[PDB]
Amino acid sequence: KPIIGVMGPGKADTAENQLVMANELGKQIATHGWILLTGGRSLGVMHEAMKGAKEAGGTTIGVLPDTSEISDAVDIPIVTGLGSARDNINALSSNVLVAVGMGPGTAAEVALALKAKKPVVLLGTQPEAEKFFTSLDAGLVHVAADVAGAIAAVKQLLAK
Amino acid sequence: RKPIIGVMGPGKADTAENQLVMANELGKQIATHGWILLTGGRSLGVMHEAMKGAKEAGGTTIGVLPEISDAVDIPIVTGLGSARDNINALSSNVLVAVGMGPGTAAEVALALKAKKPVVLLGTQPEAEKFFTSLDAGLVHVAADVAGAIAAVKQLLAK
Amino acid sequence: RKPIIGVMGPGKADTAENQLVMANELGKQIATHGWILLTGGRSLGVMHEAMKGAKEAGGTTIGVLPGPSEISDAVDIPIVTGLGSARDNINALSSNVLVAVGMGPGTAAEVALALKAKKPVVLLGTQPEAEKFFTSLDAGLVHVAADVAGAIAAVKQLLAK
Amino acid sequence: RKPIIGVMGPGKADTAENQLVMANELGKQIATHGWILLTGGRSLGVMHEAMKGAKEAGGTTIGVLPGPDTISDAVDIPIVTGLGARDNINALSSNVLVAVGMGPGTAAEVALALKAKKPVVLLGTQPEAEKFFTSLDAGLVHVAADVAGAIAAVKQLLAK
């Protein structure tokens, strides 16, 4: 059962178009028979992908700093306690990683995945980010224009 | 959402034979009761047995790692090694220690520190009575797999 | 290289005043022996007193923290980690010898972790059940000290080997 | 409290030789200013030269390692973490961070420092990096053209 990780900025930092892409990304992850792994508290991109995944009957793993609540969009809550430190659990536990948008948090998570030699697809990050991460590891970086392209890169990659 | 039962225990070299038997059937019963099993993948004593108990009974297992192992449905790779995945303690609704050693002691203590109940099974007096001195209200001592599955059912309901 | 001695204690209403006084004196004796004190870096309880005692004797101190902020004023070197309820095996792995003053859930995790790292732990001001329970984890690494002088003498011997 | 300056760079042959000289001269100037050098505690790359540099000029050094561990001779205080993972320690413990060169590990440390809202001095990085990280946080990113520049950016940042 493949595991696809979604990173992306939080609620305040995610633009409306990026939110829409994130939901659609989560749906398509679910319809291709994959598990979604993302951050279980963050309310921008990561939440939208989880809702997307859930709305289309997919399994979601949320990674979390118990404490209250959760979200009902999370199926398997994995609580680390690690506060501001590295749940590079995403990076390491995923088959493929997709970033929707960009910010300091997300840049950090993408660079760890590359360091760990795992492929990353970059959706809706700007040219600045696309060129830098490609400059880090051109064999591991895939830029996608929209969700369907991102999902195609994810399919091509899992065959390998 | 399914209850998640954390199991902790020593590895191959320090797990007596009766503890492996107890671990294997504890996992069977975790699954049989419709709970998710959470434990370490890759530890080849108590923890590896509970996962198989659980799989053999058609349960869902999560394995925390720092390949493995047919019996793990969801691998969570942490990347730490000689550190703390406190994932077991904080992710799981109830924790069952089967046997005892340094690793397991640290994890029982962290669970009590996060104020979760722990069921101690096949641990011995010194461990039972020390953990009880830490938080008596959170520490439950079971005699056999049955008394431990029992204590777990009686804890999810509260 | 200067030896580093790790000190671990319980908290605050898990702390009695004999333990605060013993932690201060332990921390002085550590600094007087030319050793670095490594402990938790909050201005609270047993770890804080060890730190004030080391500073008072002209010792060097390292405080480990999670997060952000308010470092004890006795901390020379603050090590800020970003982990919350997550360990924080820094004390255990970085110290040559570790000393527990009192006992609580947190110190018990810390002590068990250090034994698993094959590091010697000196127990000071704990109850027979802790003493007995850790002794049963590893007889070879657990030193029960009766007072601060005994603690210091166990560290001394452990470093001389 | 003596200030702590953290240095980050690449390891093996993500590392050009002039980077190795800049790192060593930088460590040397950090120690001459009465500052502590915090770095990765290994015997390789930018971080080791910076350490050797600091020592040679009478400075104190802190080396952060994973598990378990012994570690350069230039390290006074070893901080052994056992998080084989993320030492987020540099980012959060240093007053100022200086990156010498760039690679995946460095990229994550820098983004984490900017996520923690700490200023980063970028020495000997390519303009893709200078541009990307400036795109993340203009206010926190300082491109130095050389070791003297890098020090006068620290010195001033330590003064605000």
Automatic annotation (TrEMBL), chain D:
SUPFAM superfamilies: MCP/YpsA-like (SSF102405). Signal peptide: none annotated. Pfam families: LDcluster4. This is Molybdenum cofactor carrier protein. It comes from Chlamydomonas reinhardtii (Chlamydomonas smithii). The gene is MCP.
